[PDB]
Design a protein around this nucleic acid. Structure first.
Ligand code: DCT
Ligand code: MG
Ligand code: NA
Length: 359
DNA sequence: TTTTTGGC
DNA sequence: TTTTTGGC
DNA sequence: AAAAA
């Protein structure tokens, strides 16, 4: 009867009846994330997450009874929204100069919290002043971010995601004809838009040297076709908390990870002119065939669903879950699974469909 | 930097 | 008061 | 921020 504090024990579809509340909570979490106050950031993210799962809109304070992740601070924000249809706390964040600058600077691909603070303390407030400054030096990633800014700020839609899927499939099958390409992330959860397109590549017949060289061969193929705009391996990046999977280094050694920017020609997109092409972010994961169920679960998301699955495993089941395996800490054995359903069953959880993982 | 919960 | 909040 | 201990 009671709503669980874990997102892995709730069904969260794209039907949100509480957008007025969750938009204000996302603004407050984002402000704390950009300022690195991680404890309170997560508390606002959890509060936003549970409200997204509600099958009715909050219309009175009596509706917050028996709902987890709602303390005195979150209750006062909800109360304030019930009163005038707006949050005075979220409105102050939207008018904050540090929030506005950080939000704008980190909207450029390759700009992390350290670079955005650096620019803010120099007195910069706009992207035109940053781009035209005579002394500033930029990384190759930041250069791609500025050169393809308008295409990246506009999001990828489902027709564009499927056209990129065709490019990935053609390239992969040239080197591994038996390879299976699965679209993961937000698009797997039924989202109609995304900041990127995510893929999981697996091959039953591939060898260790073949698995380790596939992403190298795929990106070289795109480079020869004139489709590669930017490329980097995750091993040489160092990402901020928002993009950190929090996995063991021996777990990550098992996979091959690559992130690109692809030139997507309009003639490849089947949907409802300009330069005739659009720059698209693509994230690629190569995983060993035997670890495919754990990798599909881990890269489907959402971020909130993943971290609560692991928190539940640790604190409720005395288990250890990651993107390659499930370990029972008490019995000292690994639990085998060939499907996402088998993983949920080992955890003692009712199976949650990917379209219900939008926590 | 806050409050809540649950055994001592 | 100190610890956890997705890994060891 | 909000638990947990
Ligand atoms: N800190 C993070 C970030 C990501 N992920 C996982 C789950 C989703 C997957 C792909 O990540 P994103 O592309 O960033 O997110 P998304 O769900 O696809 O959403 P969008 O691409 O639309 O921002 O990686 C995670 O476990 N923890
Ligand atoms: Mg994505
Ligand atoms: Na960024």
């Amino acid at each position: 009867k009671k709503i669980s504090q874990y997102a892995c024990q709730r069904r969260t579809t794209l039907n949100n009846y509480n957008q007025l509340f969750t938009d204000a909570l996302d603004i407050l979490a984002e402000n704390d994330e950009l300022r690195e106050n991680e404890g309170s950031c997560l508390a606002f993210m959890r509060a936003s997450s549970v409200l997204k799962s509600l099958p009715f809109p909050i219309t009175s304070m009596k509706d917050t009874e028996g709902i987890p992740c709602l303390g005195d601070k979150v209750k006062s924000i909800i109360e304030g929204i019930i009163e005038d249809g707006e949050s005075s706390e979220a409105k102050a964040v939207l008018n904050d100069e540090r929030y506005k600058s950080f939000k704008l600077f980190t909207s450029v691909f390759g700009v992390g919290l350290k670079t955005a603070e650096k620019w803010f303390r120099m007195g910069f407030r706009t992207l035109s002043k940053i781009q035209s400054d005579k002394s500033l030096r930029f990384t190759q990633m930041q250069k791609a971010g500025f050169l393809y800014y308008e295409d990246l700020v506009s999001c990828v839609n489902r027709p564009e995601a499927e056209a990129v899927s065709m490019l990935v499939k053609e390239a992969v099958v040239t080197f591994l004809p038996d390879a299976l390409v699965t679209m993961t992330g937000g698009f797997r959860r039924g989202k109609m838009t995304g900041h990127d397109v995510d893929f999981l590549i697996t091959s039953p017949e591939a060898t260790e040297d073949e698995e380790q060289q596939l992403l190298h061969k795929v990106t070289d193929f795109w480079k020869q076709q004139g489709l590669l705009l930017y490329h980097q391996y995750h091993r040489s990046h160092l990402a901020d908390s928002a993009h950190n999977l929090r996995q063991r280094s021996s777990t990550m050694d098992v996979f091959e990870r690559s992130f690109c920017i692809l030139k997507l020609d309009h003639g490849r997109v089947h949907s409802e002119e300009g330069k005739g092409w659009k720059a698209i972010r693509v994230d690629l994961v190569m995983c060993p065939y035997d670890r495919r169920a754990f990798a599909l679960l881990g890269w489907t998301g959402s971020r909130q669903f993943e971290r609560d699955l692991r928190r539940y495993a640790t604190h409720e089941r005395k288990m250890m879950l990651d993107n390659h395996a499930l370990y029972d800490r008490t019995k000292r054995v690994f639990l085998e699974a060939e499907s996402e359903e088998e993983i949920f069953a080992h955890l003692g959880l009712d199976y949650i469909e990917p379209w219900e993982r939008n926590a």
